Amino acid sequence: ILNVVKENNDNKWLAAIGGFVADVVFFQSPPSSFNSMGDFIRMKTFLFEILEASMEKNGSVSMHARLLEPQ
């Protein structure tokens, strides 16, 4: 997870998965490690689920993920 606050104006955070920047949708709540870590959240590795992958006309890949949290 790159940012500790959802992308401004967007309801989704950003993740760095496999050399691509994806939009991560959380189940309901954001794990508490976010507030705790803060701006160092990128220092930790989380598990994600890749929902879909799309291709835009600019030649980018629109990867949508889901922050699988231990439960």
For position 56 contacting another protein by CB under 8 A, the verdict is: no
Residues 6+ apart with CB under 8 A from 66: 24, 25, 26, 27, 48, 49, 50, 51
Q: Does 5 bind another protein (CB under 8 A)?
A: no
Closest C-alpha to 15, from 56, 27, 26, 28: 26
The binding track of 24-53 with respect to another protein, each residue x by CB under 8 A or -, is ----------------x-xx-x-x-x----
Q: How big is the site for another protein, counted in residues (CB under 8 A)?
A: 13
What residues make contact with another protein under the rule CB under 8 A?
16, 18-19, 40, 42-43, 45, 47, 49, 59, 68, 70-71
